[model samples]
Target: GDHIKVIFFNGRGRAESIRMTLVAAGVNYEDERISFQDWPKIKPTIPGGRLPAVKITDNHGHVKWMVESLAIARYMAKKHHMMGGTEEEYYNVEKLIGQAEDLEHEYYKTLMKPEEEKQKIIKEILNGKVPVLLDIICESLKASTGKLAVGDKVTLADLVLIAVIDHVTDLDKEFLTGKYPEIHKHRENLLASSPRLAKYLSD
Candidate 1:
C-alpha cells in the first residue's frame, strides 16, 4: 500500500469525509491541517489552489494529487477495498454517498450567509429541503436494515452518511427531530455503534 497525505484547513470542514473514509478502512494518512492565513502561501502549490487535497505517494515517490472530497473518498475507498463487493452494491453505495454530499452542500449553504439570511435559509432547510432529503435517506436506511447503505457490510457510504448527519446535528437539532425519526434513530445507531468515532466525539 502507498502512503496518503491529506491537506486541509484546521477545521473538519470538507476534509472530514476523506478522513473518516481512511479511518474506517484502518488506513494511516497524514492529516495536514493548515491555517487560513497560511493558505495564501500554500494555495499556489496545491493541485488546484484548493484548501483540501489528497496526495498519494508510492515507495518510489510517484505522486498523484486528487481534489474534491467525493473523488478523494472514492479513490481511497477503492484503494482500501472498502467500496463494495458487487457492481450493484458499489453503484448503490455511490448513490448514497452522492446523496450525503448533496445534504452537506445544502447545510453549508445555510451556514455561509448573514445572520438574518442564514436564519431564513435555516428555516427553509428545517421546514422544506432538509425534511425531504432526510426522508429519502431514512427510507434508504430502513430498506437497507441499518447495515451498509447498499451492501451487507461496511462501505464508504456509511461513513459519509455519518459525517453528513453529524454535520446537520451540530448545526441544528431541529433537523434531526420528529420530522425525521428514522434519521434520528440512524444517527443514534451510528454514534453508539462505532466506538472509535464515539471516543473521538467524546473528546
Candidate 2:
C-alpha cells in the first residue's frame, strides 16, 4: 500500500473520484477537507495553490506534493492497475474519464453562476446535458461488450463515472437514479464488489 493524502474542499466535488479510486484500490489515505474560509489561507501553501492536490510519501521517505485533480487520480489508477490491461483498453478508459470530467466541468460552471442565473443553468443541465451524458455512458457500456464501463474489469473509468454521476444526484436524484437501471446497477455491483469501498461509502 502507498502513503497518500488528498486535499480538497469540504464538499465532495472534484476529489470524490480520487477518493473512490483509492478506496476501491484498498489504499489507506488521509482525506483533508478544507473549508471555504480556510481555503484562501491554505491555498498559498499548496503546491499549485489549488484544491484537489495530493501529498504522497514514497517508500524511501521522500515526500512529494502533486497538483491537478485528474492527473493525480490517473496516476493512482495507473499505479494500482486500474487504468486497464492494454493500450486499446487504456484509450477506452480515458475516453470515459474525459467525459466524466467534462460533466463535472459543466456542472461546476452552473454552480458557479450567479443566483438568478444558476437555477436556469441547473435546469438546462439536468434536463439537457445530464441525460445526454448518461445515455452516452450507457452506450459505451453496451459497446464495451462487457459489464464494466471500459473493459472486462473495473477501471478508473468506472470509478470516475460513478463518482461524477453521484454528484449529479444533488440536482435530481430520482431522475438520475430511477431513469438509469444500468448505471444504478453498475454502482451497486461495484460497491458490492469490494468490502473496503462499500464500507467507505456507507460510513
Candidate 3:
C-alpha cells in the first residue's frame, strides 16, 4: 500500500540523500517537491517547519511524520537494512555519518558566502578538509569491503557519504575526487551495483 510521501523544496539539496535512501529500499514514496512561495503556507504545520520531512501510514493504519534530514535518512536506512549487519558495522556507519555531517555543514556554510569568497574558501577549507576526509574514506574502503563504507553491501555510511560527495561536487567537483580514486570508485560502483539505486542514478 502507498504510505510514504517526501516533501522538500524543488532542488536536490539536503533531501537528496533521503530520496536515495527511499529508493534504495524500493519503497514507493511520493517525491513531493514544492515551490518556495508555497513553503510558508505548509511550513508552520510541518513538525520542524521545514522541508525534507516524511509522512508515513503504517500497515496498521497509523499515520506518522518525521523531520531532520539525517534522522530521517537513518530511520529509512534502519528500516530498510541499510544500517549494516553487526555492531561493528553499525559503528563504522555512524562514524562515516558523523564525518559526512561535519563535511556537509562546512561545505554549505562556506558556500553561502559572497561569490567572490568561493575560491578562497575552497582553498582554505576544501583543499585541506577534502583531502583529509577523502583519504580517510579511501583508506577505509581499501581495508573494508572496498565496495562500500562498511560491509560488503551498501550501508547508511555509503549512502550519506555519497550524498556529501554530491553536495561538495555541486560546489567544486575536483576537490572530492581525483587523487582519491577509491572515493570515486566506491560511488561509481555503488550506484552501478545496487538494484534499488541503479534506476535512480540512471535517471
Candidate 4:
C-alpha cells in the first residue's frame, strides 16, 4: 500500500477526521500543517483552493491528489478496504458519512462565531436543527445495532461521526450532554472499543 500525505492547517479543524481514519487503519501519513503566512503561496499547488487535501503517492513517485474532506476520506477508506466490502454497505457508509458532514457543518457554524454570537447561534442550533439531526443519527446507529455506521466493521464514516461528536462535545458541553445522549454513547463506544482510535484520542 502507498503512503498518504495530508496537507492541512495546524489546528484540529476539518482534517482531523481523516487523521483519525488513518490512525485507525494503522496507515502512515505525512501531516503537512501549513501556516497562514504560507497558505496563499501554497494554495495554488493544491488541486483546489483547499487546506485539507490528501495526496496518495506510490513508491514509484506517482501521485493522486484529492480535495474535499469527504472525498479524501472515502478514497482513503476504500483504498485500505476499511469501509464496507459490499455495494449496499458502501452506500450505507456514504449515507452515514453525509449525515456526519451535515452535523459537522452545523457545528462549524457555531464554532466560527464570536463568544457572544456563539451562544445565540448555539441556542438556535440546539432548538432548531441539532435535536432533529441527533435523532436521525441515533436512529441510524440503532438500525446498525450500535456497531459501525454501515457494516459490522469500522469504516471511515464511523470515524468521521465519532470525531465530529467528540469535537462538538468538546466545544459545547451542555448541548452535547443534555441533548445528544445517543451520540455521546456512540462516541464513547468508538473511543472505548477501538484501541487505535482511543490512542488517537489520547494524542
The residue-by-residue lDDT of candidate 4 on 1-203, one tens digit each, is 68688889846787887888788788788888999899889989898788798888888989888888867777778888867888877777877888877887787777756789988877776677666777888788777744567656788878888777766666566656565566766766676667988887787
Cα RMSD (angstroms) for every candidate in the order listed? 2.4, 2.1, 2.3, 2.3
TM-score against native, each model: 0.86, 0.89, 0.88, 0.86
- Model 2 lDDT tens row, 32-88: 888878977898889777888898888887888988877888888899999888998
RMSD of 2: 2.1
CA lDDT of 7 in candidate 4?
88
**Model 3 stretches astray by more than 4 angstroms:** 58-62
lDDT of 3 at 158: 81
Clashing residue pairs in candidate 2 are none
RMSD of 4: 2.3
Give the per-residue lDDT of model 3 (tens digit) for 1-203. 54888888845677888888888888778878888688878888788788788888778888789889879988889998988788878888898888787778767767557877876886776757766776676677787754678877878788788778877787776664446788788888887768778778668
Error of 3 at 158 (Å): 1.3
TM-score for model 4?
A: 0.86
lDDT of 4 at 125: 69
User: Of 1 and 2, which scores higher on lDDT?
Assistant: 2
